[PDB]
């Protein structure tokens, strides 16, 4: 039980992921869309001490989409929360930023919204 | 890469970042005070490998807002892209989530933009 482990989200990209006593997120990431092959280098960090009320553990990570294979010019960060439980989740929301020319600064960044499980849907 | 350095948004944070190599992004995110109480550890990746087409180059990186003073129970991802110059920048868009319960999850996320310079 907790963030250490393997996350897929809904659309079945896979999450590899570390939670360090420091706070620091560190691991792979995998994506079944976009310009994307294999893994790419994650880091990120989260609450090591959350509030014992009942909320979730905030966290967030970074993926710059260049690897060996691949350089899409382009990152995704994800800013979100774990909740623990029967089937234990992070929802998290993102936003991923391309390299752009300034006249095309306004289409730079995509959002969206990836819930995790450590069950593959 | 001209992204290692000190970099001031426009209400007087600031935020120390070392650019490595392998694309890591490392340092650490204050207030203009920079007071022991308000710095926390700041952990990222950006593209080491840019186009040259005049394109900026993406990055982004996340702060936990806890350290050893103090815990707001949240965190900020920021998403953007360098450009380079006499006049460099970072522009950024942020996500700010703080933990809740299920209840109150629909308001958990704060959402705004950020422009990082080189000057104060």
Redesign the interface.
């Known amino acids: 039980a907790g963030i250490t482990g393997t996350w897929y989200n809904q659309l079945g990209s896979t999450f590899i992921v570390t939670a360090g006593a420091?706070?620091?997120?560190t691991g792979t990431y995998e994506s079944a869309v976009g310009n994307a092959e294999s893994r790419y280098?994650?880091?990120?960090?989260?609450?090591?001490?959350?509030?014992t009320?009942?909320?979730?553990?905030?966290?967030?990570?970074?993926?710059?989409?260049?690897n060996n294979y691949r350089?899409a010019?382009?990152?995704?960060?994800?800013?979100?929360?774990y909740?623990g439980g029967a089937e234990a989740r992070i929802?998290?929301?993102?936003?991923?930023?391309?390299?752009?020319?300034?006249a095309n600064?306004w289409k730079?960044?995509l959002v969206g919204h990836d819930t995790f499980t450590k069950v593959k849907p």
Request: hydrophobic share 35%.
């Open positions: 420091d706070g620091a997120l280098v994650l880091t990120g960090r989260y609450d090591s001490a959350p509030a009320d009942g909320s979730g553990t905030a966290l967030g990570w970074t993926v710059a989409w260049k350089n010019h382009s990152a995704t960060t994800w800013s979100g929360q909740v929802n998290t929301q993102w936003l991923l930023t391309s390299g752009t020319t300034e600064a730079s960044t």
